[PDB]
């Protein structure tokens, strides 16, 4: 599940992998992909927020492998513009954008 909140020009975006209690969930393999589908970052969730500094564009967060007892979550498509607006599923924010992938 996908959401956004708060916590050429580059924009600083924070990413969390969480469970339904909002705990940071470790052990998920994550990729960030550009609008062409190319993987531009790969990481393993580790209980900490993950930082990104991104140029304007459309991107996708993809969970490629989930920890034990979880299904892989749906990918999160988002956009970033020159003015720092970050938009996820029709919800836009500016300033301290924080995208959360919720693992059920």
């Amino acid at each position: 599940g996908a959401m956004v909140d708060t916590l050429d020009s580059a924009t600083h975006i924070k990413f969390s992998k969480r469970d339904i209690d909002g705990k940071e969930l470790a052990g998920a393999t994550m990729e960030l992909r550009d609008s062409s589908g190319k993987t531009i970052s790969t990481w393993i969730s580790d209980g900490q927020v993950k930082d990104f500094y991104l140029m304007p564009g459309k991107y996708t967060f993809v969970e490629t492998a989930a920890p034990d007892g979880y299904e892989v979550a749906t990918a999160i498509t988002f956009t970033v513009n020159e003015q720092g607006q970050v938009t996820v599923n029709g919800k836009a924010t500016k300033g301290d954008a924080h995208i959360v992938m919720v693992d059920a």
Side-chain angles (χ1 to χ4, degrees), residues 1-102 104:
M3 68 166 283
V4 64
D5 66 72
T6 62
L7 172 51
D8 258 14
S9 301
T11 296
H12 182 196
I13 301 306
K14 290 185 173 286
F15 171 81
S16 289
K17 177 92 253 308
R18 294 181 171 167
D19 65 15
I20 62 157
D21 294 304
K23 299 196 182 79
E24 303 299 315
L25 177 62
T29 303
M30 297 295 311
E31 292 180 9
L32 175 63
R33 301 180 180 172
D34 70 19
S35 58
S36 80
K38 181 189 164 185
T39 303
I40 62 177
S41 186
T42 308
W43 70 103
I44 190 97
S45 68
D46 67 2
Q48 302 292 315
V49 173
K50 172 81 180 70
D51 294 287
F52 292 102
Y53 292 76
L54 300 179
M55 302 311 104
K58 176 267 199 182
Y59 300 89
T60 309
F61 287 125
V62 177
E63 180 180 27
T64 60
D68 293 347
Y70 293 88
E71 310 147 6
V72 167
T74 303
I76 302 175
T77 299
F78 70 97
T79 66
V80 180
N81 73 13
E82 167 63 16
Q83 297 162 329
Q85 184 167 80
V86 179
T87 308
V88 177
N89 300 333
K91 181 173 159 191
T93 191
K94 298 167 85 196
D96 302 0
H98 192 158
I99 294 170
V100 174
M101 180 176 278
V102 184

